[PDB]
Coordinates of C-alpha atoms and ligand atoms in Angstrom, one line a residue:
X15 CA 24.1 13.2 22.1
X16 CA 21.5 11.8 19.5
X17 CA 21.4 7.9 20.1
X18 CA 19.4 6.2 17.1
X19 CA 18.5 2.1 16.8
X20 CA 18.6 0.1 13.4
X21 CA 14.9 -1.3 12.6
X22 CA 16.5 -3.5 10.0
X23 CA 19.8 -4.9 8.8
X24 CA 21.5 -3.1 6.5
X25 CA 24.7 -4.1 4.1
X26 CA 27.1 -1.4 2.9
X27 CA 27.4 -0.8 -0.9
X28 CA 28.8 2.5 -1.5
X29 CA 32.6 4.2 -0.4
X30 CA 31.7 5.7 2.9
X31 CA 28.4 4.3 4.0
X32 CA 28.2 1.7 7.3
X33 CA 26.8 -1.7 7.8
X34 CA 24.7 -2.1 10.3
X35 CA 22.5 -4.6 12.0
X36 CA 18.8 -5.1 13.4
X37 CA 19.6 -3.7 17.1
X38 CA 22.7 -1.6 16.4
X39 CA 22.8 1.9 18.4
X40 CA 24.6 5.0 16.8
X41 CA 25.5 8.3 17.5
X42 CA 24.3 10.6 15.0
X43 CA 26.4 13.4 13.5
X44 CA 25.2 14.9 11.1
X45 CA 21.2 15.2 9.9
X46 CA 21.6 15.8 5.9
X47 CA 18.6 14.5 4.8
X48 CA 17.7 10.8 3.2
X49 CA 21.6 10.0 4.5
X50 CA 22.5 10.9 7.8
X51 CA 26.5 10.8 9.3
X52 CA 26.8 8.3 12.5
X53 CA 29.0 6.4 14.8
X54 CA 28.2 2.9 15.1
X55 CA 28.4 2.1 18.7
X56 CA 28.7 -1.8 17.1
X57 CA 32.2 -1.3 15.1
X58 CA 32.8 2.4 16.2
X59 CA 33.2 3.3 12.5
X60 CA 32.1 6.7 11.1
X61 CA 29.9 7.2 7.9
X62 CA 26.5 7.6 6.6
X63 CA 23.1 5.6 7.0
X64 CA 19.9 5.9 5.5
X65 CA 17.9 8.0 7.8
X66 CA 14.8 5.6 7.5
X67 CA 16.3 2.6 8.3
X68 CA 16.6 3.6 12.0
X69 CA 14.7 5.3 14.9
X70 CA 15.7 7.8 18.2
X71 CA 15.8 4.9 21.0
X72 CA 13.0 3.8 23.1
X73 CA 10.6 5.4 20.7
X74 CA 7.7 4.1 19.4
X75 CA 9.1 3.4 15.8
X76 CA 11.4 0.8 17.8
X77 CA 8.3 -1.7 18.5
X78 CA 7.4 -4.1 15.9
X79 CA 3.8 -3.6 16.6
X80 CA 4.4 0.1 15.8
X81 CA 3.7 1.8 12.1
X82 CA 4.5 5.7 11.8
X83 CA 2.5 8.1 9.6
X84 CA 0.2 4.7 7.7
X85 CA -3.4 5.7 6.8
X86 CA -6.4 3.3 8.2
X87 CA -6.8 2.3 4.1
X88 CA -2.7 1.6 3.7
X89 CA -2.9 -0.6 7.6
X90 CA -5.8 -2.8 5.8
X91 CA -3.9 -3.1 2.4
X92 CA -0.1 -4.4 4.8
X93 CA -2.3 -6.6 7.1
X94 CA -4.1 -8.3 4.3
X95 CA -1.0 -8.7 2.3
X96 CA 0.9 -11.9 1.8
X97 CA 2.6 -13.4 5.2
X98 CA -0.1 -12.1 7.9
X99 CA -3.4 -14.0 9.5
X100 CA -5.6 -14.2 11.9
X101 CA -5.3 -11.9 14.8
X102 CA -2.2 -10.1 12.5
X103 CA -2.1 -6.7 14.4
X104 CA -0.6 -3.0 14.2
X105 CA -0.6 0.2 16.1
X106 CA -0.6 3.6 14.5
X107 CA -0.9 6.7 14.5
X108 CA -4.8 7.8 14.2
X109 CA -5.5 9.5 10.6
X110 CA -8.7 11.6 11.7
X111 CA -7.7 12.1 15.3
X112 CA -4.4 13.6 15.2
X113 CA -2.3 12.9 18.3
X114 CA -3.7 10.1 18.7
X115 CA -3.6 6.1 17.9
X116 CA -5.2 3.3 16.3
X117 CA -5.7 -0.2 16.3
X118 CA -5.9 -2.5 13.1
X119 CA -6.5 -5.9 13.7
X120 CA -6.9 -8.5 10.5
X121 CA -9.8 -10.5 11.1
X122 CA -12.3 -12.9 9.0
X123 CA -15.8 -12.7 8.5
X124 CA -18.1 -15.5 6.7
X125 CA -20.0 -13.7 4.3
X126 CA -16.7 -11.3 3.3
X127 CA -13.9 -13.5 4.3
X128 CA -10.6 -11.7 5.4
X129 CA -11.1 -8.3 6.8
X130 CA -9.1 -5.6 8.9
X131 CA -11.2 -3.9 11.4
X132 CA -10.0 -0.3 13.6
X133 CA -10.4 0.5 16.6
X134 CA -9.7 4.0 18.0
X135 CA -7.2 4.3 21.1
X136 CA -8.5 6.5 23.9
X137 CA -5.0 8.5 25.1
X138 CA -2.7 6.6 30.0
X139 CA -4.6 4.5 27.5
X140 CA -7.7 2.5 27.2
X141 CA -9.9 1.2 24.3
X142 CA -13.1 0.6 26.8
X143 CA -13.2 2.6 29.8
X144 CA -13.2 -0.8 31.8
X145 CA -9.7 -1.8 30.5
X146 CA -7.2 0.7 31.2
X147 CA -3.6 0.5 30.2
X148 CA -0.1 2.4 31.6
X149 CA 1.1 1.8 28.1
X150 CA 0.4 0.4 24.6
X151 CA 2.8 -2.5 25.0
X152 CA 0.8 -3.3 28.4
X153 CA -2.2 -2.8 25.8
X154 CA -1.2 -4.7 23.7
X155 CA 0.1 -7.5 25.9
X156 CA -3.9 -8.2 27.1
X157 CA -5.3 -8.5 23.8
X158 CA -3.1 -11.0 23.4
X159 CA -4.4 -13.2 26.1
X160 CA -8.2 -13.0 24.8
X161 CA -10.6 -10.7 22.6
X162 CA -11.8 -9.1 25.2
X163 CA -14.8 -7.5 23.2
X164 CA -12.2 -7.2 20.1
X165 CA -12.9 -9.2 16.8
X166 CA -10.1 -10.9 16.9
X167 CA -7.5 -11.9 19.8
X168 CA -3.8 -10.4 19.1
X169 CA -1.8 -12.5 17.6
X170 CA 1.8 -11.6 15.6
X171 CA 2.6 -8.0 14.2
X172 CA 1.7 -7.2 10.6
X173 CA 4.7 -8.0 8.4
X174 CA 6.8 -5.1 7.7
X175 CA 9.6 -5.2 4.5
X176 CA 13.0 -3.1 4.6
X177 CA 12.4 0.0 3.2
X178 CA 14.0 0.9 0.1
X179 CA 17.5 2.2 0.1
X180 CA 17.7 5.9 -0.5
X181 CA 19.6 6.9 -3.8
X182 CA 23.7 7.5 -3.4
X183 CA 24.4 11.0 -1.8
X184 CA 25.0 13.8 -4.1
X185 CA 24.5 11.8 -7.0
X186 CA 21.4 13.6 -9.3
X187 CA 24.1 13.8 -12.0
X188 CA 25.6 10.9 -13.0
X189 CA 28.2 9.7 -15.7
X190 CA 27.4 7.6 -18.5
X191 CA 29.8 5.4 -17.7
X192 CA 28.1 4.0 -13.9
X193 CA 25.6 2.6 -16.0
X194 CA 24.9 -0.8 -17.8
X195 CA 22.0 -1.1 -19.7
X196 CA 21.2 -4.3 -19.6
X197 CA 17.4 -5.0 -21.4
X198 CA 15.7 -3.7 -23.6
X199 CA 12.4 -3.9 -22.2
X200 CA 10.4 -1.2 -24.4
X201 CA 10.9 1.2 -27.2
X202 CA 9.1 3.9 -28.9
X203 CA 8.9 7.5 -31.4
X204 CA 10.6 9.4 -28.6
X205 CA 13.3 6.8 -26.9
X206 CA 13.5 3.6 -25.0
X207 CA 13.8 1.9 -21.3
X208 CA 16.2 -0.4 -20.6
X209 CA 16.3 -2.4 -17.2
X210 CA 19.8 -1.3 -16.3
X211 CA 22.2 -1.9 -13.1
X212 CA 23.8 1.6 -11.9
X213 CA 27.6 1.1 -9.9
X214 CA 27.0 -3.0 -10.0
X215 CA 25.1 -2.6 -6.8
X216 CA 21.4 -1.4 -7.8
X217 CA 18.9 -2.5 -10.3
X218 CA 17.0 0.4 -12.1
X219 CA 15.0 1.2 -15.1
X220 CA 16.4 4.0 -17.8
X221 CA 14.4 5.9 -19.8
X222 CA 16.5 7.0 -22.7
X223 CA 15.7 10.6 -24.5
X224 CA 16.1 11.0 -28.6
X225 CA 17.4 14.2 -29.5
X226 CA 14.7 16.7 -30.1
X227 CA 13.4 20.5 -30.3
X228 CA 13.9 20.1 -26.1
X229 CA 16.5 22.3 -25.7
X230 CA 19.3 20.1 -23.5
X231 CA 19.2 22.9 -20.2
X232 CA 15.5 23.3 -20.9
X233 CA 14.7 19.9 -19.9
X234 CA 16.6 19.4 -17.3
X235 CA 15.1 22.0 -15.2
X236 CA 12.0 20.8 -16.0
X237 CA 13.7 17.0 -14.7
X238 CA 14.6 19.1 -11.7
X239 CA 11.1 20.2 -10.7
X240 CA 9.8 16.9 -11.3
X241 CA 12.3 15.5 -8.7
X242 CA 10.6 18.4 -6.5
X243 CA 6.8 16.4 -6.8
X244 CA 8.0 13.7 -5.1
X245 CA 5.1 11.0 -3.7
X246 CA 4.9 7.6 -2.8
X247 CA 2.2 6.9 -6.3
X248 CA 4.4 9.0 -8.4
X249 CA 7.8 6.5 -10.0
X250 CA 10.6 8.3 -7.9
X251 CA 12.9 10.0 -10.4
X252 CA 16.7 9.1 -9.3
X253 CA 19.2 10.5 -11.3
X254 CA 20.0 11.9 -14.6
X255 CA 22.7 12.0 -17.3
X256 CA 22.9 15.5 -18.9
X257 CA 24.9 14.7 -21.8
X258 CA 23.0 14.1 -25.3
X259 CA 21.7 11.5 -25.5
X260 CA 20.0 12.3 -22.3
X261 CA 19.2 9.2 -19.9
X262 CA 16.4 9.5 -17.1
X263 CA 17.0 7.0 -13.9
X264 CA 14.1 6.0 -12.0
X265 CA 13.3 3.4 -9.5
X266 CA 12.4 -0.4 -11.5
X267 CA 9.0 -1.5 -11.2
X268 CA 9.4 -5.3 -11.4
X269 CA 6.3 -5.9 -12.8
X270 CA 6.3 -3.8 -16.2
X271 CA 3.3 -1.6 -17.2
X272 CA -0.5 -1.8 -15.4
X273 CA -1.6 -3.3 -19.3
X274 CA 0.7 -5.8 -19.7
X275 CA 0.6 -7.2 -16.2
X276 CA -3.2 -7.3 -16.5
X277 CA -3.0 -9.3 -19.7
X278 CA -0.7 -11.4 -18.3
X279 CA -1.7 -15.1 -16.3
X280 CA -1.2 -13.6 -12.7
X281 CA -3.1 -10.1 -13.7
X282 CA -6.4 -12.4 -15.0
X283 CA -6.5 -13.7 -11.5
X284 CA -6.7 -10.5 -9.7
X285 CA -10.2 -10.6 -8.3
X286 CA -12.3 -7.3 -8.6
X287 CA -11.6 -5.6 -5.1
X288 CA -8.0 -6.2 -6.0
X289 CA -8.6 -3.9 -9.7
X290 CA -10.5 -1.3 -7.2
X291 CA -7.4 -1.1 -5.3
X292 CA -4.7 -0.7 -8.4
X293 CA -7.3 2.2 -9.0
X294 CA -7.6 4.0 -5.9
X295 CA -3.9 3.9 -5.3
X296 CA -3.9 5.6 -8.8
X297 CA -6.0 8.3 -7.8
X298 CA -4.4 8.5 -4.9
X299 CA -1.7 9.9 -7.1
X300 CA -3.8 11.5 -9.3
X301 CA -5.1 13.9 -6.0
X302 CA -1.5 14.6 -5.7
X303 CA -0.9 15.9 -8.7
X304 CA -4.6 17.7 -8.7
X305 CA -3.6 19.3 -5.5
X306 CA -0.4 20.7 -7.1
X307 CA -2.4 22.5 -9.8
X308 CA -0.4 20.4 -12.3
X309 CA -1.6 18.0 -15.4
X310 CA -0.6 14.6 -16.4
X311 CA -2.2 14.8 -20.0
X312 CA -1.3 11.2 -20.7
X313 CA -3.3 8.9 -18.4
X314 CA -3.6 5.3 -19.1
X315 CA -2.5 1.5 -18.1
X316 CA 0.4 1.9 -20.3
X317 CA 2.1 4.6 -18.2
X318 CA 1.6 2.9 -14.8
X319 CA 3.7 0.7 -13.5
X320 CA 3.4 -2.0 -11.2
X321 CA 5.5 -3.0 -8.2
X322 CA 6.7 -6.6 -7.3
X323 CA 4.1 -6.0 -4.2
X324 CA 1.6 -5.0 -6.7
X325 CA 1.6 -1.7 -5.9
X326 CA 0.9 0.8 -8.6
X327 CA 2.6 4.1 -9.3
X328 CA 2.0 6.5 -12.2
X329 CA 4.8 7.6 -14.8
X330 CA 5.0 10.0 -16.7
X331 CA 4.3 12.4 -15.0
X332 CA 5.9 16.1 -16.5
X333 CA 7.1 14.2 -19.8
X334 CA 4.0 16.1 -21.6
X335 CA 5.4 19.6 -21.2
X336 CA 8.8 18.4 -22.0
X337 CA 7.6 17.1 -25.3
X338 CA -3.6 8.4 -28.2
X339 CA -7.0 9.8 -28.4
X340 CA -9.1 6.9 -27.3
X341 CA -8.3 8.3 -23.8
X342 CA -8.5 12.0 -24.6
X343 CA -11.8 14.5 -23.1
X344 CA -13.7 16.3 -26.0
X345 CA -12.3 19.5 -24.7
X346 CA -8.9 18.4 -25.5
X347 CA -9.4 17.1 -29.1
X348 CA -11.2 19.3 -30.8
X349 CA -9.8 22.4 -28.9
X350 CA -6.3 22.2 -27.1
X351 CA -7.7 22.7 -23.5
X352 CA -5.6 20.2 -21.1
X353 CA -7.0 20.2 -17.6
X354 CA -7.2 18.1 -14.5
X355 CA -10.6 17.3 -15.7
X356 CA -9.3 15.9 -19.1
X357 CA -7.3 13.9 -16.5
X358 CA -10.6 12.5 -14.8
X359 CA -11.9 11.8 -18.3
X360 CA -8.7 9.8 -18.4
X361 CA -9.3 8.3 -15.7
X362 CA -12.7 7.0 -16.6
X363 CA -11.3 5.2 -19.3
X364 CA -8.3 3.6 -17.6
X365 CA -10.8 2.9 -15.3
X366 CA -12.5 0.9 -18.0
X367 CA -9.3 -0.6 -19.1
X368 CA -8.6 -1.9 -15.7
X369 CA -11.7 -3.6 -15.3
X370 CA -11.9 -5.3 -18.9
X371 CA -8.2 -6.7 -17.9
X372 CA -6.2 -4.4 -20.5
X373 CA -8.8 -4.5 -23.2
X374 CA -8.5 -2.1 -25.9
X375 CA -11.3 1.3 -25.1
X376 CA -13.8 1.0 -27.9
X377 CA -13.5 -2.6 -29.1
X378 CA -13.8 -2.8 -33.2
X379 CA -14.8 1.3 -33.6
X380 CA -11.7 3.6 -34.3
X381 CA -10.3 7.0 -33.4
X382 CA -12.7 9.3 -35.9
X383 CA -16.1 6.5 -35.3
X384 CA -15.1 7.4 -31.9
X385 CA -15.0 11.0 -32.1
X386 CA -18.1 11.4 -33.8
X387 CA -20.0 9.1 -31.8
X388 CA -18.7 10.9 -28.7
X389 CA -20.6 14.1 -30.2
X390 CA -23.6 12.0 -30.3
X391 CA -23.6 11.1 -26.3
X392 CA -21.9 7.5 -27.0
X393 CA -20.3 6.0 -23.5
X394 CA -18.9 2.6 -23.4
X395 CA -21.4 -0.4 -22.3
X396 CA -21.2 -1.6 -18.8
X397 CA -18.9 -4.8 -18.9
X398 CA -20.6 -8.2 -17.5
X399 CA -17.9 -8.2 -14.0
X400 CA -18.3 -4.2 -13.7
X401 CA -20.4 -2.7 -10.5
X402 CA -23.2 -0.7 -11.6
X403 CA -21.6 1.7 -8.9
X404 CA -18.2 1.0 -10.2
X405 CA -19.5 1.9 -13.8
X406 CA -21.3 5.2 -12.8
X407 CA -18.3 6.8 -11.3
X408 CA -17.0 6.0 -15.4
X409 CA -19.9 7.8 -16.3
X410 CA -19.6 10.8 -13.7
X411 CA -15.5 11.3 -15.5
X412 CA -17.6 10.7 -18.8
X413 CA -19.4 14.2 -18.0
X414 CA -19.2 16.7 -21.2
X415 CA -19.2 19.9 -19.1
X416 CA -15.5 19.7 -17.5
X417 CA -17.0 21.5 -14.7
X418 CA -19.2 18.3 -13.6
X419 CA -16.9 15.6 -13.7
X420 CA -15.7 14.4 -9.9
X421 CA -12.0 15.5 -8.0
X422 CA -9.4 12.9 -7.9
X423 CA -9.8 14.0 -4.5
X424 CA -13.1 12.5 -4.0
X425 CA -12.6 10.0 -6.7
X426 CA -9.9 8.3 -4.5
X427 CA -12.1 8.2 -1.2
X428 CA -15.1 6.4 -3.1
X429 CA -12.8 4.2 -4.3
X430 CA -10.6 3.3 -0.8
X431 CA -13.8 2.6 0.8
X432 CA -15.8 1.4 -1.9
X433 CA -16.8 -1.7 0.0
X434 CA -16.7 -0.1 3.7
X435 CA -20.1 2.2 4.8
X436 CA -18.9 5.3 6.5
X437 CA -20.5 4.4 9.6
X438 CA -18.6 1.1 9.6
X439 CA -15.1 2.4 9.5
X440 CA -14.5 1.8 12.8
X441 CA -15.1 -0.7 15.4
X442 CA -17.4 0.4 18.2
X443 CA -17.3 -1.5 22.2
X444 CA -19.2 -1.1 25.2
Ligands
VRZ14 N1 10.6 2.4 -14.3 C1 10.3 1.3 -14.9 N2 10.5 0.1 -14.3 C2 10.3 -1.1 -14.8 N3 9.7 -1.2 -16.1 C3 9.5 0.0 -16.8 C4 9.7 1.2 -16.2 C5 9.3 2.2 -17.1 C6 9.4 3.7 -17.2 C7 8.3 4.3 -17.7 C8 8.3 5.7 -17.8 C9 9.4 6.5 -17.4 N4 9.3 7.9 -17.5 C10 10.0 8.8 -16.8 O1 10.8 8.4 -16.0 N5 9.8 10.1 -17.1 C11 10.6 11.0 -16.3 C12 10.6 12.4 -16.8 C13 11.5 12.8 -17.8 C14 11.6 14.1 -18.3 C15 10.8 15.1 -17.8 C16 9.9 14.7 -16.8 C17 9.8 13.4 -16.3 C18 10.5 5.8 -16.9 C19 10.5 4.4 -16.8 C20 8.8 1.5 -18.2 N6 8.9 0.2 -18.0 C21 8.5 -0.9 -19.0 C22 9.0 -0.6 -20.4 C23 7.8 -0.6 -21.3 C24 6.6 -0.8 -20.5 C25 7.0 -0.8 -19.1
CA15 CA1 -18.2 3.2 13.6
CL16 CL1 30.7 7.4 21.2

């Protein structure tokens, strides 16, 4: 007998799926992945819930101070997101001490300005030996009272958002006819993508496939590996429709492509660490993909997308084998050698992008000046906003030998804590 506890509301929208709210206990009945069968103890009604939207009882998940499985780089990005403040707090679970926990507490510092500092949790618990605490809510529950030796005395829980609702059970394939395309909202030599509602209950984006030299069963089980890569900086991939012309369904990134939200009014005010972000979280998907052995071969702002949250995932990604050269490595050109270290060249050059707010790569040359002058050693200028550290990790992607140009791996960690030295990752205290 399974009892599990809602973490948020949630409203019914397909046949057999429950409503629930904030609070509600169910018995569980079945565990069949992102949709789970339960009783709600609330309405004693029978059918299926998203398996993220609630918790086993009494656990940890259950407090609102609580936050499973985030990173000390994604607890700084929630806590110094929109709604939070002084004092704004989480616990988690520790990222280099496995086991264990951590404390992230938003704080503000006059030469900086808004912060998030760590401290580690000592498992009883205790963060100095002269404060010891039965539990973490007890923990918790003095820091709130005074800093004593913290940063920052406890104030309200970092915000937290619904999660998003898991795609309808069993649906991968799809008619035609649940769709409605609603706008255009780009088109090009191999299809278009519409914003589209799917069963009049969920907005999505459709990317719409021209009839080609793909062979129709050849790409879908190419669609169906891609579904396989699944990560939180790769655009989820949500259903299909197998029928010519085929359609790909994917989650909708409210705020178009990385280029045209940072030539837009609300993209020229995104301050420089903000840019570093957008590209860290972009090689954080990049690593993924590295790790994997795979290849994007088609890196650049115009096949990222942007979140409401500004949070930015890469698309794309498998469309290459299933079917620009300002962006392209040498090795790629002039032979036909695709690597993950044509991807880092890439990379370079989106970073470039990002930084000159969507500006075209070589500004006035063209494709064969380019070429030739990349034979000669050319390298794009440092712009007048760009770090002279920011601009030599460019230049280490900008490498000729393949061989010497950075991981994605490491790429992402210089970036995440580009502002951060090592040794002050964490907080330490008497
Ligand atoms: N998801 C979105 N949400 C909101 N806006 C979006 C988009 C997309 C979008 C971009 C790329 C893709 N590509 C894609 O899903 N490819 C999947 C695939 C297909 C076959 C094989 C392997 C992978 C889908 C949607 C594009 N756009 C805008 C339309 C023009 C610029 C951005
Ligand atoms: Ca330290
Ligand atoms: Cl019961």
């Amino acid at each position: 007998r399974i009892i599990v506890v809602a973490l948020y509301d949630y409203e019914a929208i397909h046949h057999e799926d429950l409503s629930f709210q904030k609070g509600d206990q169910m018995v569980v009945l079945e565990e069949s992945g992102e949709w789970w069968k339960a009783r709600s103890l609330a309405t004693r009604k029978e059918g299926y819930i998203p398996s993220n939207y609630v918790a086993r009882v009494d656990s940890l998940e259950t407090e609102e101070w609580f936050f499973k499985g985030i990173s000390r780089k994604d607890a700084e990005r929630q806590l110094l997101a929109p709604g939070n403040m002084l004092g704004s707090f989480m616990i988690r679970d520790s990222e280099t001490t496995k086991g264990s926990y951590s404390l992230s507490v938003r704080d503000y510092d006059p030469r900086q300005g808004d912060t998030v500092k760590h401290y580690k949790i000592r498992t009883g618990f205790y963060i100095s030996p002269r404060s010891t605490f039965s539990t973490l809510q007890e923990l918790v529950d003095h820091y709130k009272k005074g800093n004593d030796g913290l940063c920052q005395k406890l104030s309200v829980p970092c915000m937290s958002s619904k999660p998003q609702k898991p795609w309808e059970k069993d649906a991968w394939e799809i008619p035609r006819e649940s769709l409605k395309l609603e706008k255009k909202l780009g088109a090009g030599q191999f299809g278009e993508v519409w914003m589209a509602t799917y069963n009049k209950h969920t907005k999505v984006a459709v990317k719409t496939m021209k009839p080609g030299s793909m062979s129709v069963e050849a790409f879908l089980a190419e669609a169906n590996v891609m579904k396989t890569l699944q990560h939180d900086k790769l655009v989820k991939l949500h259903a299909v429709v197998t029928k010519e012309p085929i359609y790909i369904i994917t989650e909708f990134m409210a705020k178009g492509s990385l280029l045209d939200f940072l030539k837009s009014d609300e993209g020229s005010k995104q301050p420089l660490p903000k840019l570093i972000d957008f590209s860290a979280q972009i090689a954080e998907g990049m690593a993924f993909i590295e790790q994997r052995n795979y290849i994007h071969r088609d890196l650049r702002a115009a096949n990222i997308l942007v979140s409401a949250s500004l949070v930015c995932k890469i698309a794309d990604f498998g469309l290459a084998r299933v079917i620009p050269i300002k962006w392209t490595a040498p090795e790629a050109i002039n032979f036909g050698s695709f690597t993950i270290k044509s991807d880092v060249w890439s990379f370079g050059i989106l970073l470039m992008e990002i930084v000159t707010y969507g500006r075209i790569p070589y500004p006035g040359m063209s494709n064969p000046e380019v070429i030739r002058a990349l034979e000669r050693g050319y390298r794009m200028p440092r712009p007048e906003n760009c770090p002279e550290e920011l601009y030599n990790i460019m230049m280490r992607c900008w490498k000729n030998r393949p061989e010497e140009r950075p991981t994605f791996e490491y790429i992402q960690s210089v970036l995440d804590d580009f502002y951060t030295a090592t040794e002050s990752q964490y907080e330490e205290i008497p």
